[PDB]
Amino acid sequence: KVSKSTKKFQSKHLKHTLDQRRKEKIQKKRIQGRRGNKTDQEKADAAGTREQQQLKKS
Amino acid sequence: LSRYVKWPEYVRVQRQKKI
Amino acid sequence: MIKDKDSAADADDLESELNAMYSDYKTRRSERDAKFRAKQAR
Amino acid sequence: TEEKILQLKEDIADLVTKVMEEPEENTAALGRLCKMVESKNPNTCKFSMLALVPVFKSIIPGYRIRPLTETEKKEKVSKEVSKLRNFEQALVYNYKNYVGRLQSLSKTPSNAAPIQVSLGILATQAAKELISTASHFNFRTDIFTLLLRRICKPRISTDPTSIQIIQTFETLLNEDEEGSISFEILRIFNKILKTRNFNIEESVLNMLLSLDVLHDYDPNTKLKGNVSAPKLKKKDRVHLSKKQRKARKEMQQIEEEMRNAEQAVSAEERERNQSEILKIVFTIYLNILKNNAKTLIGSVLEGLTKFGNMANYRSLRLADPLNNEIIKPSVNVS
């Protein structure tokens, strides 16, 4: 037997939730093949520490 | 704090003119 | 309740009180923004 | 006099022990301990002045003590704040006397008795060891001035303390990001240089190469790995009353805006300090070039190349520049 909250959610919020999930999936697929989308930790690793940068300059 | 409340404006002005 | 009178020392004390009041007024009016407090910290 | 030295060491130990764990009401002990420094007896001065350094490094507060005079306060309502103010005033006075004594002892014409030379060397050592942590305190300029006058001496190779003072100044300039202490050091450095017609060693002038305020790194540089608890766990909290919780909310709201204001003020002061330091450094470099000193050309050119974009022979030199293992000289090559 379906619960009341499940019925209410499926009648109210299911459609736009699924549409938003599809939109996020499409955007992720589009951005995966592009260049220039890196996280803060990844960019910090790429730049390196001050000592690493001074070594790279030298 | 702000103790200036112990003197009203007219008293303060009339004492400032004394100096 | 002090039963004493001074001629010029009273004027000096009054001037000192007025100067202290003006300095406190300036500080209170200037400390309205935390930037001034930060600057005065250093 | 050996037993006298033993008794002197015991007395110094007793006084420092009296002062250390509770400084507030042992003010008189600190006063007499500082008064022992100015004694004419070399042993008294040496031992007391060398023993005060840990005491000051431990009891110096984290802020600058403002000259709080009672004239504007007229409070006279305290039983523990009053003794705190008394301790702060006495500490400032004692530190004034200590720094004055260090400055007077550092000035040695290198002609007096070797005991005087040793006293001057020990005083310079104490001042150098003091400024590593006491730079954010009163009378930092006097220590900076005495250290720079020792450094800017025409002959510093024979001085066994010049190397360490050079490293200390390089560290101070390297770890300063706002540019306040850097500007304070640079003003005195320029003032001394103008007196000596810009005549110093290459190692002395090489410390300006370490100015962090004249450096921009990558906007999102990776820092050292720091791990800490993001928050205290909810089930492991301490009970606070409703009044205490409201006060906590209020003080957190005050602290957040103070943090924002401090960030903005530091940001807007770093640029002004950078401009002033750029002017001073470029004036020093150009005056060296006009003086045409053959032994300083390479350092001047390296500094111009490094800090030029911020604007609008190894055997003859001593005390290699800081981080020489990583800072490959672009213009001042061997």
Add this chain to the structure above:
Amino acid sequence: EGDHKLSSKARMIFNDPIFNNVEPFDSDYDSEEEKNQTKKEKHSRDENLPDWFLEDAMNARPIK
């Protein structure tokens, strides 16, 4: 105990690394000249009434 000449506090306090090797043309800096220079600079950079009455860039365009 150890039977040392100095007491425990004296030993710990005086064994600190700061007490190392401690046992019981030509020119001297011209203070007057720098004082005169500072005064001259001060002049080239710029009473009885109360204060409440009287009062009433080289990095401007860098490469980045």
